PDB file of N, CA and C in Angstrom:
ATOM      1  N   UNK Z   1       0.825  -1.199   0.011  1.00  0.00           N
ATOM      2  CA  UNK Z   1      -0.006   0.000   0.001  1.00  0.00           C
ATOM      3  C   UNK Z   1       0.863   1.260   0.000  1.00  0.00           C
ATOM      4  N   UNK Z   2       2.089   1.136   0.520  1.00  0.00           N
ATOM      5  CA  UNK Z   2       2.978   2.261   0.681  1.00  0.00           C
ATOM      6  C   UNK Z   2       4.011   2.342  -0.442  1.00  0.00           C
ATOM      7  N   UNK Z   3       3.909   1.485  -1.458  1.00  0.00           N
ATOM      8  CA  UNK Z   3       4.820   1.416  -2.602  1.00  0.00           C
ATOM      9  C   UNK Z   3       6.210   0.968  -2.152  1.00  0.00           C
ATOM     10  N   UNK Z   4       6.986   0.387  -3.053  1.00  0.00           N
ATOM     11  CA  UNK Z   4       8.288  -0.142  -2.725  1.00  0.00           C
ATOM     12  C   UNK Z   4       9.382   0.724  -3.346  1.00  0.00           C
ATOM     13  N   UNK Z   5      10.403   1.126  -2.584  1.00  0.00           N
ATOM     14  CA  UNK Z   5      11.495   1.921  -3.149  1.00  0.00           C
ATOM     15  C   UNK Z   5      12.341   1.090  -4.119  1.00  0.00           C
ATOM     16  N   UNK Z   6      12.975   1.783  -5.052  1.00  0.00           N
ATOM     17  CA  UNK Z   6      13.857   1.122  -6.023  1.00  0.00           C
ATOM     18  C   UNK Z   6      15.326   1.101  -5.580  1.00  0.00           C
ATOM     19  N   UNK Z   7      15.661   1.780  -4.480  1.00  0.00           N
ATOM     20  CA  UNK Z   7      17.019   1.820  -3.970  1.00  0.00           C
ATOM     21  C   UNK Z   7      17.035   1.369  -2.517  1.00  0.00           C
ATOM     22  N   UNK Z   8      18.149   0.810  -2.112  1.00  0.00           N
ATOM     23  CA  UNK Z   8      18.302   0.324  -0.743  1.00  0.00           C
ATOM     24  C   UNK Z   8      18.446   1.499   0.218  1.00  0.00           C
ATOM     25  N   UNK Z   9      17.699   1.533   1.315  1.00  0.00           N
ATOM     26  CA  UNK Z   9      17.851   2.617   2.290  1.00  0.00           C
ATOM     27  C   UNK Z   9      19.268   2.624   2.865  1.00  0.00           C
ATOM     28  N   UNK Z  10      19.816   3.829   3.019  1.00  0.00           N
ATOM     29  CA  UNK Z  10      21.185   3.972   3.504  1.00  0.00           C
ATOM     30  C   UNK Z  10      21.405   5.394   3.999  1.00  0.00           C
ATOM     31  N   UNK Z  11      22.482   5.543   4.752  1.00  0.00           N
ATOM     32  CA  UNK Z  11      22.918   6.890   5.168  1.00  0.00           C
ATOM     33  C   UNK Z  11      23.583   7.593   3.993  1.00  0.00           C
ATOM     34  N   UNK Z  12      23.214   8.832   3.661  1.00  0.00           N
ATOM     35  CA  UNK Z  12      23.674   9.405   2.395  1.00  0.00           C
ATOM     36  C   UNK Z  12      25.149   9.774   2.362  1.00  0.00           C
ATOM     37  N   UNK Z  13      25.683  10.365   3.425  1.00  0.00           N
ATOM     38  CA  UNK Z  13      26.994  10.975   3.368  1.00  0.00           C
ATOM     39  C   UNK Z  13      28.085   9.939   3.672  1.00  0.00           C
ATOM     40  N   UNK Z  14      28.990   9.654   2.760  1.00  0.00           N
ATOM     41  CA  UNK Z  14      30.110   8.763   3.066  1.00  0.00           C
ATOM     42  C   UNK Z  14      31.123   9.426   3.964  1.00  0.00           C
ATOM     43  N   UNK Z  15      31.877   8.591   4.699  1.00  0.00           N
ATOM     44  CA  UNK Z  15      32.860   9.076   5.648  1.00  0.00           C
ATOM     45  C   UNK Z  15      34.157   9.554   4.970  1.00  0.00           C
ATOM     46  N   UNK Z  16      34.328   9.296   3.682  1.00  0.00           N
ATOM     47  CA  UNK Z  16      35.531   9.773   2.982  1.00  0.00           C
ATOM     48  C   UNK Z  16      35.528  11.285   2.897  1.00  0.00           C
ATOM     49  N   UNK Z  17      34.362  11.917   2.838  1.00  0.00           N
ATOM     50  CA  UNK Z  17      34.244  13.356   3.047  1.00  0.00           C
ATOM     51  C   UNK Z  17      34.169  13.623   4.531  1.00  0.00           C
ATOM     52  N   UNK Z  18      33.822  14.849   4.919  1.00  0.00           N
ATOM     53  CA  UNK Z  18      33.653  15.225   6.345  1.00  0.00           C
ATOM     54  C   UNK Z  18      34.933  15.030   7.119  1.00  0.00           C
ATOM     55  N   UNK Z  19      36.079  15.033   6.426  1.00  0.00           N
ATOM     56  CA  UNK Z  19      37.387  14.810   7.041  1.00  0.00           C
ATOM     57  C   UNK Z  19      38.291  15.997   6.759  1.00  0.00           C
ATOM     58  N   UNK Z  20      39.037  16.417   7.790  1.00  0.00           N
ATOM     59  CA  UNK Z  20      40.016  17.486   7.669  1.00  0.00           C
ATOM     60  C   UNK Z  20      41.389  16.901   7.862  1.00  0.00           C
ATOM     61  N   UNK Z  21      42.259  17.106   6.872  1.00  0.00           N
ATOM     62  CA  UNK Z  21      43.634  16.610   6.916  1.00  0.00           C
ATOM     63  C   UNK Z  21      44.565  17.769   7.299  1.00  0.00           C
ATOM     64  N   UNK Z  22      45.323  17.582   8.364  1.00  0.00           N
ATOM     65  CA  UNK Z  22      46.237  18.634   8.797  1.00  0.00           C
ATOM     66  C   UNK Z  22      47.313  18.880   7.734  1.00  0.00           C
ATOM     67  N   UNK Z  23      47.675  20.142   7.492  1.00  0.00           N
ATOM     68  CA  UNK Z  23      48.572  20.413   6.356  1.00  0.00           C
ATOM     69  C   UNK Z  23      49.955  19.778   6.481  1.00  0.00           C
ATOM     70  N   UNK Z  24      50.440  19.536   7.693  1.00  0.00           N
ATOM     71  CA  UNK Z  24      51.802  19.113   7.888  1.00  0.00           C
ATOM     72  C   UNK Z  24      51.994  17.608   7.851  1.00  0.00           C
ATOM     73  N   UNK Z  25      53.270  17.212   7.906  1.00  0.00           N
ATOM     74  CA  UNK Z  25      53.672  15.830   8.003  1.00  0.00           C
ATOM     75  C   UNK Z  25      54.743  15.699   9.070  1.00  0.00           C
ATOM     76  N   UNK Z  26      54.622  14.695   9.932  1.00  0.00           N
ATOM     77  CA  UNK Z  26      55.583  14.436  10.993  1.00  0.00           C
ATOM     78  C   UNK Z  26      56.634  13.495  10.466  1.00  0.00           C
ATOM     79  N   UNK Z  27      57.912  13.836  10.699  1.00  0.00           N
ATOM     80  CA  UNK Z  27      59.028  13.057  10.171  1.00  0.00           C
ATOM     81  C   UNK Z  27      59.801  12.433  11.332  1.00  0.00           C
ATOM     82  N   UNK Z  28      60.253  11.206  11.117  1.00  0.00           N
ATOM     83  CA  UNK Z  28      61.081  10.520  12.095  1.00  0.00           C
ATOM     84  C   UNK Z  28      62.375  11.273  12.305  1.00  0.00           C
ATOM     85  N   UNK Z  29      62.872  11.296  13.542  1.00  0.00           N
ATOM     86  CA  UNK Z  29      63.936  12.224  13.966  1.00  0.00           C
ATOM     87  C   UNK Z  29      65.311  11.597  14.036  1.00  0.00           C
ATOM     88  N   UNK Z  30      65.438  10.369  14.525  1.00  0.00           N
ATOM     89  CA  UNK Z  30      66.674   9.620  14.742  1.00  0.00           C
ATOM     90  C   UNK Z  30      67.684  10.409  15.576  1.00  0.00           C
ATOM     91  N   UNK Z  31      68.882   9.868  15.732  1.00  0.00           N
ATOM     92  CA  UNK Z  31      69.867  10.450  16.657  1.00  0.00           C
ATOM     93  C   UNK Z  31      70.518  11.689  16.026  1.00  0.00           C
ATOM     94  N   UNK Z  32      71.505  12.252  16.720  1.00  0.00           N
ATOM     95  CA  UNK Z  32      72.183  13.467  16.323  1.00  0.00           C
ATOM     96  C   UNK Z  32      73.639  13.218  16.027  1.00  0.00           C
ATOM     97  N   UNK Z  33      74.237  14.139  15.278  1.00  0.00           N
ATOM     98  CA  UNK Z  33      75.648  14.075  14.902  1.00  0.00           C
ATOM     99  C   UNK Z  33      76.378  15.261  15.486  1.00  0.00           C
ATOM    100  N   UNK Z  34      77.385  14.984  16.320  1.00  0.00           N
ATOM    101  CA  UNK Z  34      78.021  16.052  17.095  1.00  0.00           C
ATOM    102  C   UNK Z  34      79.559  15.976  17.082  1.00  0.00           C
ATOM    103  N   UNK Z  35      80.155  15.371  16.059  1.00  0.00           N
ATOM    104  CA  UNK Z  35      81.618  15.253  16.017  1.00  0.00           C
ATOM    105  C   UNK Z  35      82.246  16.629  15.804  1.00  0.00           C
ATOM    106  N   UNK Z  36      81.587  17.473  14.997  1.00  0.00           N
ATOM    107  CA  UNK Z  36      82.139  18.810  14.738  1.00  0.00           C
ATOM    108  C   UNK Z  36      82.193  19.661  15.999  1.00  0.00           C
ATOM    109  N   UNK Z  37      81.184  19.588  16.833  1.00  0.00           N
ATOM    110  CA  UNK Z  37      81.214  20.330  18.091  1.00  0.00           C
ATOM    111  C   UNK Z  37      82.256  19.799  19.048  1.00  0.00           C
ATOM    112  N   UNK Z  38      82.726  18.565  18.853  1.00  0.00           N
ATOM    113  CA  UNK Z  38      83.727  17.990  19.743  1.00  0.00           C
ATOM    114  C   UNK Z  38      85.137  18.378  19.267  1.00  0.00           C
ATOM    115  N   UNK Z  39      85.455  18.127  17.999  1.00  0.00           N
ATOM    116  CA  UNK Z  39      86.815  18.293  17.508  1.00  0.00           C
ATOM    117  C   UNK Z  39      86.919  19.325  16.392  1.00  0.00           C
ATOM    118  N   UNK Z  40      85.848  19.985  16.013  1.00  0.00           N
ATOM    119  CA  UNK Z  40      85.906  20.972  14.951  1.00  0.00           C
ATOM    120  C   UNK Z  40      85.985  20.320  13.574  1.00  0.00           C
ATOM    121  N   UNK Z  41      86.062  21.182  12.571  1.00  0.00           N
ATOM    122  CA  UNK Z  41      86.144  20.745  11.178  1.00  0.00           C
ATOM    123  C   UNK Z  41      87.197  21.592  10.459  1.00  0.00           C
ATOM    124  N   UNK Z  42      87.986  20.945   9.607  1.00  0.00           N
ATOM    125  CA  UNK Z  42      89.015  21.606   8.836  1.00  0.00           C
ATOM    126  C   UNK Z  42      89.045  21.004   7.424  1.00  0.00           C
ATOM    127  N   UNK Z  43      89.153  21.865   6.428  1.00  0.00           N
ATOM    128  CA  UNK Z  43      89.259  21.441   5.035  1.00  0.00           C
ATOM    129  C   UNK Z  43      90.736  21.487   4.633  1.00  0.00           C
ATOM    130  N   UNK Z  44      91.295  20.354   4.232  1.00  0.00           N
ATOM    131  CA  UNK Z  44      92.704  20.255   3.942  1.00  0.00           C
ATOM    132  C   UNK Z  44      92.929  19.884   2.473  1.00  0.00           C
ATOM    133  N   UNK Z  45      92.455  18.707   2.085  1.00  0.00           N
ATOM    134  CA  UNK Z  45      92.678  18.189   0.760  1.00  0.00           C
ATOM    135  C   UNK Z  45      91.584  18.509  -0.219  1.00  0.00           C
ATOM    136  N   UNK Z  46      91.446  17.679  -1.233  1.00  0.00           N
ATOM    137  CA  UNK Z  46      90.429  17.843  -2.257  1.00  0.00           C
ATOM    138  C   UNK Z  46      89.901  16.474  -2.669  1.00  0.00           C
ATOM    139  N   UNK Z  47      88.728  16.480  -3.281  1.00  0.00           N
ATOM    140  CA  UNK Z  47      88.122  15.241  -3.761  1.00  0.00           C
ATOM    141  C   UNK Z  47      88.994  14.623  -4.825  1.00  0.00           C
ATOM    142  N   UNK Z  48      89.033  13.285  -4.864  1.00  0.00           N
ATOM    143  CA  UNK Z  48      89.898  12.502  -5.735  1.00  0.00           C
ATOM    144  C   UNK Z  48      91.379  12.678  -5.403  1.00  0.00           C
ATOM    145  N   UNK Z  49      91.691  12.868  -4.109  1.00  0.00           N
ATOM    146  CA  UNK Z  49      93.049  12.842  -3.615  1.00  0.00           C
ATOM    147  C   UNK Z  49      93.271  11.511  -2.896  1.00  0.00           C
ATOM    148  N   UNK Z  50      94.499  11.304  -2.400  1.00  0.00           N
ATOM    149  CA  UNK Z  50      94.852  10.028  -1.826  1.00  0.00           C
ATOM    150  C   UNK Z  50      95.254  10.079  -0.366  1.00  0.00           C
ATOM    151  N   UNK Z  51      96.199  10.948   0.019  1.00  0.00           N
ATOM    152  CA  UNK Z  51      96.814  10.858   1.333  1.00  0.00           C
ATOM    153  C   UNK Z  51      97.156  12.235   1.882  1.00  0.00           C
ATOM    154  N   UNK Z  52      97.435  12.271   3.187  1.00  0.00           N
ATOM    155  CA  UNK Z  52      97.863  13.444   3.914  1.00  0.00           C
ATOM    156  C   UNK Z  52      99.040  13.061   4.809  1.00  0.00           C
ATOM    157  N   UNK Z  53     100.056  13.890   4.845  1.00  0.00           N
ATOM    158  CA  UNK Z  53     101.358  13.519   5.433  1.00  0.00           C
ATOM    159  C   UNK Z  53     101.737  14.506   6.531  1.00  0.00           C
TER     160      UNK Z  53
ATOM    161  N   UNK V   1     -18.979  28.136 -17.819  1.00  0.00           N
ATOM    162  CA  UNK V   1     -18.907  28.250 -19.270  1.00  0.00           C
ATOM    163  C   UNK V   1     -20.317  28.214 -19.827  1.00  0.00           C
ATOM    164  N   UNK V   2     -20.510  28.903 -20.966  1.00  0.00           N
ATOM    165  CA  UNK V   2     -21.843  29.069 -21.523  1.00  0.00           C
ATOM    166  C   UNK V   2     -21.901  28.740 -23.006  1.00  0.00           C
ATOM    167  N   UNK V   3     -23.146  28.606 -23.485  1.00  0.00           N
ATOM    168  CA  UNK V   3     -23.456  28.345 -24.883  1.00  0.00           C
ATOM    169  C   UNK V   3     -24.557  29.322 -25.303  1.00  0.00           C
ATOM    170  N   UNK V   4     -24.686  29.540 -26.610  1.00  0.00           N
ATOM    171  CA  UNK V   4     -25.519  30.624 -27.144  1.00  0.00           C
ATOM    172  C   UNK V   4     -26.775  30.093 -27.850  1.00  0.00           C
ATOM    173  N   UNK V   5     -26.624  29.112 -28.753  1.00  0.00           N
ATOM    174  CA  UNK V   5     -27.753  28.551 -29.507  1.00  0.00           C
ATOM    175  C   UNK V   5     -28.521  29.646 -30.254  1.00  0.00           C
ATOM    176  N   UNK V   6     -27.987  30.169 -31.343  1.00  0.00           N
ATOM    177  CA  UNK V   6     -28.730  31.147 -32.160  1.00  0.00           C
ATOM    178  C   UNK V   6     -29.823  30.480 -32.978  1.00  0.00           C
ATOM    179  N   UNK V   7     -30.732  31.314 -33.497  1.00  0.00           N
ATOM    180  CA  UNK V   7     -31.848  30.819 -34.284  1.00  0.00           C
ATOM    181  C   UNK V   7     -32.306  31.877 -35.272  1.00  0.00           C
ATOM    182  N   UNK V   8     -32.826  31.442 -36.421  1.00  0.00           N
ATOM    183  CA  UNK V   8     -33.321  32.350 -37.438  1.00  0.00           C
ATOM    184  C   UNK V   8     -33.319  31.753 -38.832  1.00  0.00           C
ATOM    185  N   UNK V   9     -34.258  32.212 -39.687  1.00  0.00           N
ATOM    186  CA  UNK V   9     -34.355  31.692 -41.044  1.00  0.00           C
ATOM    187  C   UNK V   9     -34.888  32.778 -41.971  1.00  0.00           C
ATOM    188  N   UNK V  10     -34.577  32.642 -43.259  1.00  0.00           N
ATOM    189  CA  UNK V  10     -34.968  33.600 -44.273  1.00  0.00           C
ATOM    190  C   UNK V  10     -36.406  33.346 -44.748  1.00  0.00           C
ATOM    191  N   UNK V  11     -36.964  34.362 -45.389  1.00  0.00           N
ATOM    192  CA  UNK V  11     -38.384  34.295 -45.771  1.00  0.00           C
ATOM    193  C   UNK V  11     -38.566  34.757 -47.225  1.00  0.00           C
ATOM    194  N   UNK V  12     -37.446  35.136 -47.860  1.00  0.00           N
ATOM    195  CA  UNK V  12     -37.411  35.721 -49.200  1.00  0.00           C
ATOM    196  C   UNK V  12     -37.916  37.168 -49.181  1.00  0.00           C
ATOM    197  N   UNK V  13     -37.386  37.995 -50.068  1.00  0.00           N
ATOM    198  CA  UNK V  13     -37.549  39.441 -49.992  1.00  0.00           C
ATOM    199  C   UNK V  13     -38.772  39.924 -50.751  1.00  0.00           C
ATOM    200  N   UNK V  14     -39.354  41.007 -50.265  1.00  0.00           N
ATOM    201  CA  UNK V  14     -40.433  41.712 -50.928  1.00  0.00           C
ATOM    202  C   UNK V  14     -40.811  42.959 -50.169  1.00  0.00           C
ATOM    203  N   UNK V  15     -41.213  44.010 -50.905  1.00  0.00           N
ATOM    204  CA  UNK V  15     -41.664  45.233 -50.237  1.00  0.00           C
ATOM    205  C   UNK V  15     -43.023  45.038 -49.605  1.00  0.00           C
ATOM    206  N   UNK V  16     -43.196  45.626 -48.408  1.00  0.00           N
ATOM    207  CA  UNK V  16     -44.417  45.540 -47.624  1.00  0.00           C
ATOM    208  C   UNK V  16     -44.773  44.095 -47.249  1.00  0.00           C
ATOM    209  N   UNK V  17     -43.769  43.236 -47.088  1.00  0.00           N
ATOM    210  CA  UNK V  17     -44.026  41.824 -46.824  1.00  0.00           C
ATOM    211  C   UNK V  17     -43.347  41.353 -45.548  1.00  0.00           C
ATOM    212  N   UNK V  18     -43.464  42.164 -44.478  1.00  0.00           N
ATOM    213  CA  UNK V  18     -43.031  41.780 -43.134  1.00  0.00           C
ATOM    214  C   UNK V  18     -41.536  41.583 -43.021  1.00  0.00           C
ATOM    215  N   UNK V  19     -41.020  41.521 -41.784  1.00  0.00           N
ATOM    216  CA  UNK V  19     -39.594  41.331 -41.528  1.00  0.00           C
ATOM    217  C   UNK V  19     -39.414  40.204 -40.539  1.00  0.00           C
ATOM    218  N   UNK V  20     -38.759  39.107 -40.909  1.00  0.00           N
ATOM    219  CA  UNK V  20     -38.473  38.036 -39.937  1.00  0.00           C
ATOM    220  C   UNK V  20     -37.400  38.474 -38.937  1.00  0.00           C
ATOM    221  N   UNK V  21     -37.384  37.813 -37.781  1.00  0.00           N
ATOM    222  CA  UNK V  21     -36.502  38.188 -36.693  1.00  0.00           C
ATOM    223  C   UNK V  21     -35.751  36.962 -36.163  1.00  0.00           C
ATOM    224  N   UNK V  22     -34.640  37.215 -35.492  1.00  0.00           N
ATOM    225  CA  UNK V  22     -33.775  36.194 -34.930  1.00  0.00           C
ATOM    226  C   UNK V  22     -33.745  36.328 -33.420  1.00  0.00           C
ATOM    227  N   UNK V  23     -33.136  35.337 -32.758  1.00  0.00           N
ATOM    228  CA  UNK V  23     -33.077  35.278 -31.296  1.00  0.00           C
ATOM    229  C   UNK V  23     -31.984  34.284 -30.894  1.00  0.00           C
ATOM    230  N   UNK V  24     -31.926  33.993 -29.578  1.00  0.00           N
ATOM    231  CA  UNK V  24     -30.933  33.091 -29.030  1.00  0.00           C
ATOM    232  C   UNK V  24     -31.394  32.651 -27.652  1.00  0.00           C
ATOM    233  N   UNK V  25     -30.703  31.659 -27.093  1.00  0.00           N
ATOM    234  CA  UNK V  25     -31.080  31.075 -25.799  1.00  0.00           C
ATOM    235  C   UNK V  25     -29.853  30.427 -25.171  1.00  0.00           C
ATOM    236  N   UNK V  26     -29.432  30.925 -24.028  1.00  0.00           N
ATOM    237  CA  UNK V  26     -28.145  30.556 -23.411  1.00  0.00           C
ATOM    238  C   UNK V  26     -28.332  29.534 -22.296  1.00  0.00           C
ATOM    239  N   UNK V  27     -27.246  28.775 -22.045  1.00  0.00           N
ATOM    240  CA  UNK V  27     -27.166  27.792 -20.970  1.00  0.00           C
ATOM    241  C   UNK V  27     -25.795  27.879 -20.331  1.00  0.00           C
ATOM    242  N   UNK V  28     -25.660  27.307 -19.128  1.00  0.00           N
ATOM    243  CA  UNK V  28     -24.437  27.424 -18.365  1.00  0.00           C
ATOM    244  C   UNK V  28     -24.076  26.097 -17.721  1.00  0.00           C
ATOM    245  N   UNK V  29     -22.800  25.951 -17.385  1.00  0.00           N
ATOM    246  CA  UNK V  29     -22.252  24.745 -16.758  1.00  0.00           C
ATOM    247  C   UNK V  29     -21.169  25.152 -15.762  1.00  0.00           C
ATOM    248  N   UNK V  30     -21.077  24.413 -14.657  1.00  0.00           N
ATOM    249  CA  UNK V  30     -20.140  24.744 -13.582  1.00  0.00           C
ATOM    250  C   UNK V  30     -19.340  23.519 -13.170  1.00  0.00           C
ATOM    251  N   UNK V  31     -18.140  23.774 -12.648  1.00  0.00           N
ATOM    252  CA  UNK V  31     -17.247  22.730 -12.136  1.00  0.00           C
ATOM    253  C   UNK V  31     -16.579  23.233 -10.857  1.00  0.00           C
ATOM    254  N   UNK V  32     -15.873  22.340 -10.182  1.00  0.00           N
ATOM    255  CA  UNK V  32     -15.290  22.615  -8.887  1.00  0.00           C
ATOM    256  C   UNK V  32     -13.744  22.619  -8.955  1.00  0.00           C
ATOM    257  N   UNK V  33     -13.142  23.433  -8.100  1.00  0.00           N
ATOM    258  CA  UNK V  33     -11.688  23.620  -8.052  1.00  0.00           C
ATOM    259  C   UNK V  33     -11.116  22.842  -6.880  1.00  0.00           C
ATOM    260  N   UNK V  34     -10.009  22.129  -7.135  1.00  0.00           N
ATOM    261  CA  UNK V  34      -9.329  21.323  -6.126  1.00  0.00           C
ATOM    262  C   UNK V  34      -7.889  21.809  -6.011  1.00  0.00           C
ATOM    263  N   UNK V  35      -7.395  21.916  -4.781  1.00  0.00           N
ATOM    264  CA  UNK V  35      -6.035  22.375  -4.528  1.00  0.00           C
ATOM    265  C   UNK V  35      -5.340  21.455  -3.557  1.00  0.00           C
ATOM    266  N   UNK V  36      -4.028  21.304  -3.743  1.00  0.00           N
ATOM    267  CA  UNK V  36      -3.224  20.475  -2.866  1.00  0.00           C
ATOM    268  C   UNK V  36      -1.963  21.216  -2.448  1.00  0.00           C
ATOM    269  N   UNK V  37      -1.308  20.682  -1.416  1.00  0.00           N
ATOM    270  CA  UNK V  37      -0.133  21.325  -0.838  1.00  0.00           C
ATOM    271  C   UNK V  37       0.973  20.307  -0.569  1.00  0.00           C
ATOM    272  N   UNK V  38       2.210  20.792  -0.525  1.00  0.00           N
ATOM    273  CA  UNK V  38       3.387  19.983  -0.224  1.00  0.00           C
ATOM    274  C   UNK V  38       4.491  20.908   0.241  1.00  0.00           C
ATOM    275  N   UNK V  39       5.263  20.457   1.231  1.00  0.00           N
ATOM    276  CA  UNK V  39       6.319  21.277   1.787  1.00  0.00           C
ATOM    277  C   UNK V  39       7.604  20.519   2.068  1.00  0.00           C
ATOM    278  N   UNK V  40       8.532  21.178   2.776  1.00  0.00           N
ATOM    279  CA  UNK V  40       9.821  20.580   3.095  1.00  0.00           C
ATOM    280  C   UNK V  40      10.334  21.160   4.388  1.00  0.00           C
ATOM    281  N   UNK V  41      11.295  20.448   5.011  1.00  0.00           N
ATOM    282  CA  UNK V  41      11.951  20.899   6.229  1.00  0.00           C
ATOM    283  C   UNK V  41      13.436  20.586   6.136  1.00  0.00           C
ATOM    284  N   UNK V  42      14.267  21.593   6.358  1.00  0.00           N
ATOM    285  CA  UNK V  42      15.717  21.473   6.228  1.00  0.00           C
ATOM    286  C   UNK V  42      16.354  21.983   7.518  1.00  0.00           C
ATOM    287  N   UNK V  43      17.305  21.210   8.050  1.00  0.00           N
ATOM    288  CA  UNK V  43      18.041  21.607   9.243  1.00  0.00           C
ATOM    289  C   UNK V  43      19.431  22.114   8.888  1.00  0.00           C
ATOM    290  N   UNK V  44      19.999  22.894   9.804  1.00  0.00           N
ATOM    291  CA  UNK V  44      21.301  23.519   9.558  1.00  0.00           C
ATOM    292  C   UNK V  44      22.401  22.459   9.430  1.00  0.00           C
ATOM    293  N   UNK V  45      22.431  21.483  10.332  1.00  0.00           N
ATOM    294  CA  UNK V  45      23.426  20.435  10.259  1.00  0.00           C
ATOM    295  C   UNK V  45      23.187  19.515   9.080  1.00  0.00           C
ATOM    296  N   UNK V  46      21.914  19.265   8.730  1.00  0.00           N
ATOM    297  CA  UNK V  46      21.604  18.469   7.551  1.00  0.00           C
ATOM    298  C   UNK V  46      22.103  19.152   6.276  1.00  0.00           C
ATOM    299  N   UNK V  47      21.957  20.477   6.197  1.00  0.00           N
ATOM    300  CA  UNK V  47      22.338  21.194   4.988  1.00  0.00           C
ATOM    301  C   UNK V  47      23.825  21.081   4.697  1.00  0.00           C
ATOM    302  N   UNK V  48      24.649  21.223   5.720  1.00  0.00           N
ATOM    303  CA  UNK V  48      26.092  21.153   5.516  1.00  0.00           C
ATOM    304  C   UNK V  48      26.579  19.771   5.115  1.00  0.00           C
ATOM    305  N   UNK V  49      25.979  18.747   5.677  1.00  0.00           N
ATOM    306  CA  UNK V  49      26.367  17.365   5.329  1.00  0.00           C
ATOM    307  C   UNK V  49      26.098  17.083   3.860  1.00  0.00           C
ATOM    308  N   UNK V  50      24.978  17.559   3.319  1.00  0.00           N
ATOM    309  CA  UNK V  50      24.673  17.338   1.915  1.00  0.00           C
ATOM    310  C   UNK V  50      25.613  18.075   1.001  1.00  0.00           C
ATOM    311  N   UNK V  51      26.089  19.271   1.404  1.00  0.00           N
ATOM    312  CA  UNK V  51      26.975  20.054   0.547  1.00  0.00           C
ATOM    313  C   UNK V  51      28.326  19.393   0.372  1.00  0.00           C
ATOM    314  N   UNK V  52      28.702  18.453   1.216  1.00  0.00           N
ATOM    315  CA  UNK V  52      29.993  17.767   1.051  1.00  0.00           C
ATOM    316  C   UNK V  52      30.025  16.967  -0.240  1.00  0.00           C
ATOM    317  N   UNK V  53      28.930  16.330  -0.606  1.00  0.00           N
ATOM    318  CA  UNK V  53      28.863  15.493  -1.803  1.00  0.00           C
ATOM    319  C   UNK V  53      28.288  16.291  -2.944  1.00  0.00           C
TER     320      UNK V  53
END
């Protein structure tokens, strides 16, 4: 008496919308490098050289 | 709505030989008017969810 729908009843709005993505990205940090603060840095030779005397 | 139903006929022409006349008779008919209504209801939170898709 109430007629039959041609589509299955469902909630209209999918969850793929209604979502806010934060603009940033968090990056893994790992340990630190501190040899320069301990003993300094000095440029002596050049690339494609062999030895220092 | 109405109708007219005219009437009249010729008698052939001649001087001093009377003048025929015409007339009419009207009738009427009536009907009834039917009206229907339909509306809608929209909520503030419902409106925004639909705009996503």
